[model samples]
Target: RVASPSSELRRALEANEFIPYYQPLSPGQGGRWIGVEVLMRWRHPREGLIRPDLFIPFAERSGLIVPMTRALMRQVAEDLGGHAGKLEPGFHIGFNISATHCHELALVDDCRELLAAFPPGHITLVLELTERELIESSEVTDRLFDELHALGVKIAIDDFGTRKFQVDCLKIDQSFVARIGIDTLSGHILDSIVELSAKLDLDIVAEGVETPEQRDYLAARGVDYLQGYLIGRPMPLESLLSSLTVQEGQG
Candidate 1:
């Protein structure tokens, strides 16, 4: 989410212009409701829905992704605050971020404060690293990632195959607990991720899976999670409460 053409979009956030939307992220072979990912949606009162692709580049170039990410983390904390008493075990919110933003100390404080305020084992938070540039070398970011690991939050590589550097990403960043995405949402994707996860001892979560065929394929291949429109589309926080029950491995 972006606030300005090139600023932190701080003004937009102050004006309450950008809307936050919740997307469903279900577990794969386990039949558990892992958690939801908070995606930012900007619906200008006069202009209607603003596409993120246009504003995200502005934020990246402007170095506003840091503040924008902090805002989202606070949002996630508040969302968890409401559900603390009734929180399901292992249930947590997922936020995708750029590692470039992670390099900043301000964001480190944000993560620490969010976890301290929320408490551990209560909100098993997961953050996705979506930038190739930040993780291309992997070695360069190893120390930076060590900072994240010390906090006890779940770290994931969001897109494991889109970029050429993912191989290096998986190598140096041994701290990563899961791969939040398969290369594609196909049977082949399911099979490949299953193999990779099995060999590497990593959990494979398939994102953008919008069909039962995709779900069945991942399940058949023993995938760890399912995330997409197929499980459930974006809904309000209240709506997600009744839908959080784990189904696959409950019995």
Candidate 2:
């Protein structure tokens, strides 16, 4: 039986059971593991681990996503503060920001506080936004991103190549950086996107890389970053620390 989205989502928020799981991003061409994308997971007492696709839709509909996102950002800040020294310097942590967040100016302060945890240039923060989020922009959106970029927070397009927007492309800090659909691109098209990204001085991340062929193809085409199961799945902070420690030992 499927639980009611409203009640179950409310219970999860009230209990504070939603948590951030980090998936590592491996930069191509011998670049050190540059960052991790902070993905949310639900720890249901009755069920084991739950993926975001299951509940995020309901949370979004019921307007619970705003609080849920705040909690995830706060948790990431705390996690990084605790383990900052163990990770690579200049390591970044990325998070998805709901379109709803843009409607509220408080998001500016929320991000400011999070960035304050890491010293200047010691780490970077990237905010992933979907096409739906930018379909309609206002004075608030402009001011919001102006402030974010002023703070050195980068913006990335999640699930690139999947949607079409009529709006004027948001100045595209990093455009069409896919985490799931890059696998479907032919070599020529993938090469073109990577080359264009270079010409525009934009960084691109090739996501959902799960095999040697995919990894080699993207790396050869000069993709800036590689992420997905080929690198590592989302894991708890402790597990991330362990993996980092091992990687450091090998270095």
Candidate 3:
């Protein structure tokens, strides 16, 4: 099955079958649905739905992830960016990427185009390093990060580290959140991460906050933002647009 992915993924890419799912992100404890993280999904013509975790690693090994990510962004531009006028101003949208995307400046252009699709300040674009993509860096890699910041793009890297390009925000990993009540050690680390980020003046967004307990725990510590199913599960573009209507009604 693993070996079959090489051809299968290529076919899927060629067919343009991959699409983005939007996961809403909220700010503070009593929050409005301000923005969403662009999550990728694979719509297999025959096999039905496929999760990113299942196919992305295959695409990663094959080096197709770069193009795949490119496509996803373009789709976001078309789907959400096309409807940017309807979104709340300063809406935050995030994308998760890993190592295959480094070593080039194509990403710089992608962000430029993505931002250009919307009015200035209408969207806050964040690129989240969901894995150890920072391990290897080169001349262009450094410039890529710099160019993003120069253009007003935000970068969220791993928790508790990386300053080469100046990470804009710290994302408390979900693993620590999952251990909130059961494990004292992880709970302590999560607490320190929030307090440390506060003093450093860098914003914090906690991921995988599924339960009310997790939500209260993070928000009580002054976490800048909270993301996960508790806020809202990832949804289709149409649903995102419809749900946002409800968001604007409150205004």
Candidate 4:
């Protein structure tokens, strides 16, 4: 998962020990469940649930991320299919994509399978593009997303405003949100960023909201989506359902 390589990690991938975890996102103003982001996790037989930061870099470095992503998509399709009854209408699922996927035409085929697993309009798939890479504005990139968007897949620029590209959603990075406070200069900066997102006519998503103060601040500023520890932590599918059950009981 780090800069160094580990054969044990390779063996784990071969054993298919990776899995997807769900983190909920809600309207900043406290509305019903809106959607969730599908974060990858390593279910080590000995170590329990391992965070992505521990292994994702290794996967990317080893070029195993391609197959890993495929597996993740399949799992998402299977899991969502099994829980279709539980999910609200218009529930959307998000997953991050590396630059490799940006050029891989086969990604469309896999996504086609993903979309087919659910009924039309029942769920939406959002693919988050990396901010580090400058996506080329050309035939390959345009055709890739053009086809995806046509299939009802929405494209989002992660760490929005960090770079320029054609996208449907703007995700404000955690680095910016971490700076928010009542009287801090960062609060003013956050306000300006939110205002700019609105002016750009993009759906604004605030990430890493950990406290009530942070949540309230973004909600007051009209952030469309809020994601962080205060709302819910990244959890397994069953655990996520359990949390939902608790919320329903409280309601």
State each candidate's clash count: 4, 0, 0, 1
Give lDDT tens digits, candidate 2, residues 1-251: 77776888878888989999999988777555779999999999999989999888878778899989888888888988766776688887888878777775788787888888777677888888876676665333366777778877888777654533222112122223332245444444556766767776678888777777777766777777888787899899889888887888766
Best by lDDT: 3
TM-scores for every candidate against the unseen true structure: 0.78, 0.86, 0.92, 0.88
Off by over 4 Å in 4: 1-10, 135-141, 245-251
Candidate numbers, best lDDT first, in rank order: 3, 4, 2, 1
Please report, as a residue range, the 10-residue window in candidate 2 with the lowest summed lDDT.
Answer: 165-174
Candidate 4 has a TM-score of 0.88
Give per-residue CA lDDT, model 4, range 161-196, as digits (tens): 445555778788888788777457777777887898
> Candidate 1's residue-wise lDDT over 118-143, tens digit each?
64767666777754755554554455
RMSD of each: 6.2, 4.4, 2.5, 3.1
**Ten contiguous residues minimizing lDDT sum, candidate 1:** 168-177
Name every residue pair that clashes in candidate 3: none
lDDT-best of 2 and 4: 4
Worst 10 residues of 3 by lDDT: 157-166
lDDT of 3 at 61: 84
